[PDB]
Structures are given as structure tokens and as C-alpha cells.
Paper text:
In recent years, the emergence of imine reductases (IREDs) has had a substantial impact on the application of enzymes in the preparation of chiral amines of pharmaceutical interest. IREDs are NAD(P)H-dependent oxidoreductases that catalyze the asymmetric reduction of prochiral imines, but in certain cases also enable the reductive amination of prochiral ketones through catalysis of both imine formation and subsequent reduction of the iminium ion intermediate. The enzyme designated IR77 by France and co-workers in a previous work has 100% sequence identity with NCBI accession sequence WP_053252429, annotated as an “NADP-binding domain” from the nitrogen-fixing bacterium Ensifer adhaerens, also known as a species of Sinorhizobium. The enzyme adopts the canonical fold now well established for IRED structures. An N-terminal Rossmann domain (residues 1–164) connects to a C-terminal helical domain (195–294) through a long alpha-helix (165–194). Two monomers closely associate in a domain swapping arrangement that serves to form two active sites per dimer, each at the interface of one N-terminal domain with the C-terminal domain of its partner.
The structure of IR77 was determined, and using this as a basis, structure-guided mutagenesis, coupled with point mutations selecting improving amino acid sites suggested by other groups, permitted the identification of a mutant A208N with improved activity for amine product formation. Crystals of IR77 A208N were obtained in the P212121 space group with two molecules in the asymmetric unit constituting one dimer. The dimer featured one more open active site and the other more closed, and more resembling the conformation observed with those in the wild-type structure. Following building and refinement of the structure, electron density for the cofactor NADP+ was again clearly visible within the active sites at each dimer interface. However, the Km of 0.94 mM was greater than those recorded for wt-IR77 and A208S of 0.61 and 0.60 mM, giving 60% of the catalytic efficiency of wt-IR77 in this case. The lower catalytic efficiency of A208N over A208S is compensated for by the greater stability observed by the former. An increase in melting temperature (Tm), measured using nano-DSF, of 8.2 °C was observed upon binding of cofactor, over 2 °C greater than the difference observed with wt-IR77 and 1 °C greater than A208S. This improvement in stability is illustrated in the capability of IR77 A208N to withstand significantly greater substrate loadings than either wt-IR77 or A208S.
Numbering used by the authors:
A (entry chain A): 2 to 293
B (entry chain B): 1 to 295
The structure:
Amino acid sequence: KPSISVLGTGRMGSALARALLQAGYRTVVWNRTSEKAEPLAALGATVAPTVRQAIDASGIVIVNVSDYAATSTLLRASDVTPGLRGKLIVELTSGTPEGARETSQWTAAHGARYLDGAILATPDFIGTDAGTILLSGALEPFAANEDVFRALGGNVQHIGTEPGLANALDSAVLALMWGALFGGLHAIAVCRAEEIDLGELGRQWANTAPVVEGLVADLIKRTSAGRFVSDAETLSSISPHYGAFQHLKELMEARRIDRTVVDGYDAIFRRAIASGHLHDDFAALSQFMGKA
Amino acid sequence: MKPSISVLGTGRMGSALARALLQAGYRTVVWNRTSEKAEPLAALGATVAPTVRQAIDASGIVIVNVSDYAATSTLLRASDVTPGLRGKLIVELTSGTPEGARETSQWTAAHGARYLDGAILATPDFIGTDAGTILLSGALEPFAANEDVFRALGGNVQHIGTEPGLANALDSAVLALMWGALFGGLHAIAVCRAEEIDLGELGRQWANTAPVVEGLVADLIKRTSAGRFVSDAETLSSISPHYGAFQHLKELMEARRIDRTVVDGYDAIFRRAIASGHLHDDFAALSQFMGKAEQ
Ligand SMILES: NC(=O)c1ccc[n+]([C@@H]2O[C@H](COP(=O)([O-])OP(=O)(O)OC[C@H]3O[C@@H](n4cnc5c(N)ncnc54)[C@H](OP(=O)(O)O)[C@@H]3O)[C@@H](O)[C@H]2O)c1
Ligand SMILES: NC(=O)c1ccc[n+]([C@@H]2O[C@H](COP(=O)([O-])OP(=O)(O)OC[C@H]3O[C@@H](n4cnc5c(N)ncnc54)[C@H](OP(=O)(O)O)[C@@H]3O)[C@@H](O)[C@H]2O)c1
């Protein structure tokens, strides 16, 4: 089994390193702040002191830093670049499809194979069967080294050959996540302003989460089939949503909780109603997301 | 199956409550502004009152389930009804605001009635099932004295405190979580359409990652309850990498002419947290910046 290098030992870079070690890979790590990489030494990692050293130790280089601008400062420096020849670079950093494409062109021009990924996981999911990572780029590199990706999670998937696909789907899945989390921020604010124990909110969310998961799956299934008009299988219709949402708005007004996000919800509800969708399926709101 | 229960409102949800009281063997008295809508409950064993005042006089417990609190007011504050509320337990299960709950608590007490305010977190189908969820707030004694009645409405009926507005507030909060996930869905769909991604693919990715999102939300609630805004060893994610990736979604929505009213809201909260030193704190730190930037 070949040696794997990991550039970045933040929360997520460390989790990747831990999973490689658990699977019995010689794992070489590097981090701008060397102090943060020590605990992986304790676990069996070799700590490289320099990028160039980490790149020379291994045939596969998994990058997990803040952004592609950072990855550039690391890999595009004169004293690293010549070391990339013959290597597989796996950019698991978050980015834009353009960034994936720009990095694909550049890595190829300097003699290295490339995969661009997006980790659809928190660190606790890495190295578990449920662990999801999306990979895009040439198929051969993923097929030749499949056991390495299998170490990272049971649901690491090659989803296409155009490098930017992982980053594109990622932005969509992150939009879902941000939606749920800022709804959390709204709920937490409402409970704090109304003197509601947040441990109670946490019990209420554990009870309703599975229903809300179904409401979101149904919204996607219906939008894919154009089924915007309410029917017998409708779970969620615009009228009752819009009606109850008035109560949340009134509460947030009274407690001076910021309404910029909910006023956003309200503008989408109102465009759909102004177009006769008041008793249509929630999925009809998918027609009213555009700028103008 | 001992005391008599009246239900005002036989709409979709009012009916389900009445059906569940009958299933449990309660003498059930119903009334509806549209008489015709209450007939099917007669066939099931309900006595149909012709007037509100008659429905209120028949029973010691009055469950109200109408459209809005303005409606409840019309019904209960009428000269011919009000004096009949003396010694009654009124259980307002209509959806409303915490202020509405509070205004009704004050008023009901002034006219000599005990009060509970509720919010139903269930569709009519799940009323009278073990899963059936209803939140109640107000004085505890009335709930504890009549607990078998609430058990009839569902297995997961809960008294959550003494301040009457808690039920309506917790309801709005649970729905804010739901709306957050759904409008996130609307955003994700829109991004897929603009990038020519099969929505069947988004649907498979959601089945794969829903638990990751569910854990992020649970963790955000647990940490906010303990004030843990500083990033630590147990942190799942922190503000800097969130704000970094969120830049890519903003740029994409600009380029594909997707409406940004909602994400610009996210962006203002990210900015206030960073301006106050939380760039590398836990996501939970954003919870400190949900207040109106005003005054
Ligand atoms: N955490 C999650 O749940 C999650 C989910 C999926 C994807 N991701 C993505 O994975 C990446 C890592 O996130 P994380 O949670 O691990 O964040 P983090 O804990 O803040 O880790 C940041 C990492 O980037 C490095 N870095 C920052 N600026 C750099 C620069 N100019 N040059 C070199 N290295 C630099 C840090 O080095 P120092 O330690 O030297 O500062 C560290 O290795 C991000 O793109 C994130 O969006 C995160
Ligand atoms: N359906 C659900 O799944 C669900 C779930 C949770 C919460 N809820 C809440 O339950 C409550 C009842 O809604 P629903 O689903 O039963 O709605 P619905 O089917 O529209 O029933 C509306 C009811 O309100 C009555 N009403 C409205 N205005 C009135 C007035 N001014 N005077 C007298 N009666 C009046 C109606 O009388 P008419 O029959 O004469 O119009 C009818 O009984 C709402 O607050 C709703 O938010 C419903």
C-alpha cells in the first residue's frame, strides 16, 4: 500500500489523516502551524517540516486547507512545483467549479494527475461507512487507488470527469445545510427571547427532524417531476405554511430579532401567491427563486 | 371516559380532536359556525350543540380549535357566551403568537376560567395516535387533574411550562427549523438548475447527507444551551471555513441571477460575528448576532 501525504491538519485535515492511519497507510502530514500537527505524530503520522518534504515522501497528496488561493501559495512556490511531477493531487478544499478547472489545467501543465473533491461530512463521519465525499476528474486515478478513498469513507463516489462537478454539487448541498442551520439560529433566538430551555428545543428537533427530512426529499422529488399543483399526495401546501409563518414574523418583530432572512422567505411566498399558487404544493415556490 | 368535553371548531383539525375524544369514550359536544360541517361527528356519537353558549354549558372542559385568535375572541367575548366561562377549563389549541396566548390567559382569568394554551405539532391523521404531539403551557394543576383527556389526543402531549406563551413560542421555533431546511431546499434546487445538475442527483445526495445536517443542527442547539461559542476539541465546524465556502454560493447566485435576499441575510450575521472577533469560533457563536442591528 503506497504512502499518502495530507496538507492541512485543521479539524478536517486531521480527520482524513486519522482515517488513513486507522486503515494502515504510512501517513505524512504538514501544517503551516507545526504545533497543530504534533498530535498526529502520537497516532503514527510522520510530520514533514516543509511542504516539499511532504510531497516527496508520497505518491498521493490530499490537500485540505481554507481555500484554493492558499493551495496555490503552497503548491505553486518554485521550491514545491518541480516535486509535483508524477504525483496524484486530490484537492478536497472547498471551492468554485472555475477553481477546480483552473487547478486541473495548472496541475496537468506541471506533470501531476488531479482529482477535485468536496467532503459532504463533518470530521466525525470521516472513516465511517456513511462518510460521503464527491470526486470529479479523470476516472483512472480514482479506479487505480480506490482502496485509499475507501479508507476515507464507505460512500466516497466518483461522479464524473469534468473537474468542477464536485464543487458545483457541493455549493447546492451546502445551501441546504446553511438553510437548516440559520433556521436553527432563528429557533435558538426565539427560545432565548421567550425564556424557553434550549434542551427542550433540542428534544422537539429530535422528534420532528425525520418529518422535516421527508418534507425536503418530497420537495426535491416533486420539483423534478414538475408537480407544483396540489394533489392527494401533497404533504405541504403553501396556504398553511404562509399562515403559520405570519406568527413567527410577529414574534420576531416583538423581540427585535433580525427579519432580513424571514422577509426573504416572505417575498418568495408572496410572488407565488400573486401568481395564484396560494393552495398549490410548496414545490411551486421553486418557480419564484429568480432575481427578476 | 368520565368528564364531558366540548370542542369549538370542526374544521380539519377540530374534527380529528373530536374523533379522538369519542374513540376514548368521552361524551363529546361539538359546535361549528357552519352546522353542516359538524354532522359527520353526530353519526360518530358527538352531540351537536346549536350555539357556543350551549356547548360551553354542556361541559367543564372547552377545547377551542379555530383559524386564528381573532376568531376565538369573536366566539368567547360575545355578551351571550362570556358569563358561561365561569369555572371552565378553556384549552386554546388554535395557532397563535405568545402575546395572543398571554392576552387570552389574562382575559380568561378575569372572567373566572382556568386556561391552557397549546400548539399541535401533528397533521389530523396523527391525532389520537401514540406519535401525536401537542405542546401545552399555563398553570400545571389543570393539566395534571385532567391528564387522561390529553392522553386521548395523542401519546406525546406534553406540558412544557407555566408561562402561557411557551407553547406558541416553541411551535414558531420548531417551524423556523423546518422552514430553514425547506428554503434551503429551494436554494439547492435553484443551484442545481443553474449548473445543469439532475435534481435526482441532489435527491440522492440529500438521502446520503441529511444525518450530517441533522448532527450540525443538534450540536448547534446543545452548544448554544451551554454558552459554548469558543471553538474547542469537540467543535464540528467553525465560522471561517463556513464563511469561505459561503462566498462561492454568493458568487454563483450573482452569476446565475438567483435572488440573494435570503443569503444576504446569512452574510450580515456572518459579518457581525467576525467584526466581534469570532472568525475562528464555533458556528454557535453566530447565535450571538441574531438581534436587529438597529437603535
Ligand atoms: N469542518 C467541516 O465540517 C468541513 C466540512 C467539509 C469540508 N470542509 C472544508 O475543509 C477545509 C478545512 O476546514 P477545517 O474545518 O479543517 O478548517 P480549520 O480547522 O480552520 O483548518 C484550516 C486549515 O487550513 C490551513 N490554512 C489556512 N490558511 C492557510 C494558508 N494561507 N496557507 C496554508 N495553510 C493554510 C490551516 O493551517 P493553520 O492551522 O496553520 O492555521 C489548517 O490546516 C475547508 O475548506 C472547509 O470548508 C470542512
Ligand atoms: N390541519 C392541520 O394539520 C393543523 C396542524 C397543526 C395546527 N393546526 C391549527 O389548527 C387550527 C384549526 O385549523 P384547521 O386545520 O382545522 O382549519 P380549517 O379546516 O380551516 O378549520 C377552520 C375552522 O375555524 C372555524 N372558524 C374560522 N373563523 C371562525 C369564526 N370567525 N367564528 C367561528 N368559527 C370560525 C371554521 O368554521 P367554519 O367551518 O364555519 O368555516 C372551522 O371550524 C389552526 O389554528 C391551525 O393552524 C392545524
